[PDB]
Design a protein around this ligand. Sequence first.
Ligand SMILES: Nc1ncnc2c1ncn2[C@@H]1O[C@H](COP(=O)(O)OP(=O)(O)O)[C@@H](O)[C@H]1O
Ligand SMILES: Nc1ncnc2c1ncn2[C@@H]1O[C@H](COP(=O)(O)OP(=O)(O)O)[C@@H](O)[C@H]1O
Ligand SMILES: [Mg+2]
Ligand SMILES: [Mg+2]
Ligand SMILES: [Zn+2]
Lengths: 362, 558
Amino acid sequence: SFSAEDIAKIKKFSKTRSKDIFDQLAKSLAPSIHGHDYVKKAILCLLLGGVERDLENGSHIRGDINILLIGDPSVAKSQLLRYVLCTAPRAIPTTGRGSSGVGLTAAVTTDQETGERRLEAGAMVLADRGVVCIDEFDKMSDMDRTAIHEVMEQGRVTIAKAGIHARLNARCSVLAAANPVYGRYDQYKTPMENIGLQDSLLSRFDLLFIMLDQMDPEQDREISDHVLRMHRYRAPGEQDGDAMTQIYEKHDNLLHGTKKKKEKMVSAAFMKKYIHVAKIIKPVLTQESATYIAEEYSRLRSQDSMSSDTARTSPVTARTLETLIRLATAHAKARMSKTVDLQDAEEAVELVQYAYFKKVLE
Amino acid sequence: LKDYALEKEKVKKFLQEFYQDKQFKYGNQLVRLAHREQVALYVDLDDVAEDDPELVDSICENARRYAKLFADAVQELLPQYKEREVVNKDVLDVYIEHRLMMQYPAELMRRFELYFQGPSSNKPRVIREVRADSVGKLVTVRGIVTRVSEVKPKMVVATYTCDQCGAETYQPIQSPTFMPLIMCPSQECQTNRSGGRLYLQTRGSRFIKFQEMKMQEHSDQVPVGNIPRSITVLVEGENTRIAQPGDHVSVTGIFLPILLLSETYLEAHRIVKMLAASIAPEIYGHEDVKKALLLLLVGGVRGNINICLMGDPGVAKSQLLSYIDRLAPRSQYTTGRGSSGVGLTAAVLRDSVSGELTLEGGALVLADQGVCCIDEFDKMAEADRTAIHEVMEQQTISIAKAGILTTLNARCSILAAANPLPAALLSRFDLLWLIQDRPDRDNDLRLAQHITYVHQHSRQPPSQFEPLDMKLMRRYIAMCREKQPMVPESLADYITAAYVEMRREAWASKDATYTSARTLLAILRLSTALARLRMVDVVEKEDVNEAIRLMEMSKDSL
DNA sequence: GCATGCATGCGCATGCATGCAT
DNA sequence: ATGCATGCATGCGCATGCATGC
Ligand SMILES: Nc1ncnc2c1ncn2[C@@H]1O[C@H](COP(=O)(O)OP(=O)(O)O)[C@@H](O)[C@H]1O
Ligand SMILES: Nc1ncnc2c1ncn2[C@@H]1O[C@H](COP(=O)(O)OP(=O)(O)O)[C@@H](O)[C@H]1O
Ligand SMILES: [Mg+2]
Ligand SMILES: [Mg+2]
Ligand SMILES: [Zn+2]
């Protein structure tokens, strides 16, 4: 693939920062990638995750989140996917045509040695309580999407071939990266034409993000500065020209910059430990936030008459309320606490506002 | 070490001094066993707890020895309780009587079997956790049956008759394979040294029923990222014909190896099976979509009912199907192509015992006389859809391929879920329910409040009418299904009219309508089901009115 | 809407190696 | 002491199911 005295460090950092914990964790997610704060927050929410609930009648409520990123080429989506693969404990990359439905889903093979039928686990079966990254999601066939639908809905796989039948657990989370049908995102056309996906598939996803490569001179200057600062960097202790744990990372003149001396980034190991500890915690929802969330859900649904000229990326269904609750639970997990507060729901509401609506240019 | 004579005496006195249950149960059991009115006796280890608990531990550690001791004790106790001769005696009883009239193995004269029931204090184990530590002990396992073998006879004691003498030789069998005898060990032949040869007899020999079965772990007990494991159980005696494929069972038995590696197996002792419109209280709304499910569960007087629900995504159709699958006693649930083709219908497979080919059925075969649930119906293959249509219309499946020529009986009721109409569904399905969603602030607020309450308190909001548990609903359905109402002759003059005008209305609305004798048959079936719900012998008008209202509501869903 | 390419189970026979019951 | 039945590949012939390309 734990320490002893870092518990004091974790307790001190939590009791000190409190509210700023989530912001600092989101900011220090990936120094090598510039911008995209909301995407980093969503990735942190995936790392934390929701709460699975089981009731008396045996009904199951999903606790995982799903995010789909769509945008122009060279906006650092594959880099984010690779970073999630590196950081997540159980992370599995499965490209579009790399694996078929038989590879993603467990299958049945008749054993010649004994004459019996045995089950061989698929890609999603192995990644229980983990992360599955799918690059080039648009290239995937329809049948694979139909197979993935059951896992995205209830996280279980039903298999049956005469003489044997079973149900396997597939409680996983999915990252997906896809390109627009026209290659580059057309500003004028509606998002429905650009995405080119059925409503059910989008609804089963929890969050949709649209990223654009706007050629603004200031943004280009900042991006070039960051890229060349990262490229000029060389690891300390290595001779020039050669071929080939503190809570806050040591400041570097190249990785951070002179201006960034006022702030520091969290170390990777401490971040991993804190993420694990937070994932252990089981928060509880309060009554104050429930009415607020319900009223804001009603406002979101009634916004059809208040959308102005902006369009909606994804339809609003009953799953959106569960997504709101799950994001609130994740944000509550971000800082070590016990109850859900108002700002906790406000953050998820802001995320939904940013994700769900987009302006259309003439 | 300990002498077995003292423990045998303790067992004998225990079998005679357990009045504390007021009738003497063991006396009656022994009387029935002596008069050949009972062929099986079960011993409760919870009953033994009143006596010295050391016997319980000893039995849990050396079960086979104590089973044999109990059998011997019961055999010795049998003569005392005898009062009369056998009223009607069969072939084996005739042989036993003739042999007694004229040493014999104990099991040859014996005609009863003894079994142990696991203590309630003994916690059931997991198939994954039974290992070398449990070899030779008594264990309890909960699982799901997947494969069962046919019933066949198995030798217990073999009887040989000599060529030149009337003496009969007896050979016990304690191995899967045995070596038949040749020479006669009788004293007459030994003295004369005639060298006669023995011949096997089927009539004098003793046979017992034998069965194989396989069990798998529940999906809840499977660890992270693993696959359920399987175990093999042997069935003999009166325990035969109890377990069937697809059932959730609990078996108490012994863990024994087979011959320095060895292969393990289980020997079974006890096998056990594991308004009213309150279906899924967790889901808000859909008041008129739940009575149809109740009528589907109750069924008609062929009287089968098939229901299809078409709806936009996010209205939670799958949860209703899962609840129906869980509630029904015999039920199967299909998600899509993961159980296509061979998953349905049947396939030919090798046998564990006979070594030949036998037919094993699919989901539809298992769901015979039950309810089947299908999700994402529109995504199924053409062959699966044709098979489903054949099941719906004819209730039998016909298979004719290389090596297979069979007609399987499948009397199952189908509930299907789908997304958005084709004429096949309207012409074939009895009831179609189209669920459409539109934004309303008050309804949205109510649904959000209910969903938040469900997520917070982990229980549906309380109301004036409390719902009911699954056991009570199952018992109520079982009680309701007993009766069979009849339609009175006079009400025909009503019902026919209620049909004709309806069709006339359908003739007025030429846009999109479908009516035939199938609608009348569905109305009659629904009316009979509603009358059965009231336990009335004669169908009443209110049932017909309710069925007509339900059909109209289904039709009015655009 | 259908024939074909690509696995995969089924049933079978055939050849090479070895381990011991009559 | 010796010859043979069996375990373990491997070719042969076949049917069956899933995907796609015109
Ligand atoms: N905002 C950014 N900050 C730093 N580097 C970037 C940024 N956007 C793109 N890049 C660089 O451009 C490359 C984009 O490649 P890739 O991540 O494969 O694009 P995509 O995932 O959109 O196909 C990366 O190697 C990355 O180093
Ligand atoms: N009327 C309702 N009452 C309560 N919860 C609902 C309702 N409709 C939808 N939901 C919630 O929305 C989710 C819908 O998911 P799912 O059942 O997979 O939808 P579908 O079955 O339509 O694909 C469920 O988890 C359920 O908790
Ligand atoms: Mg990329
Ligand atoms: Mg569904
Ligand atoms: Zn003789």
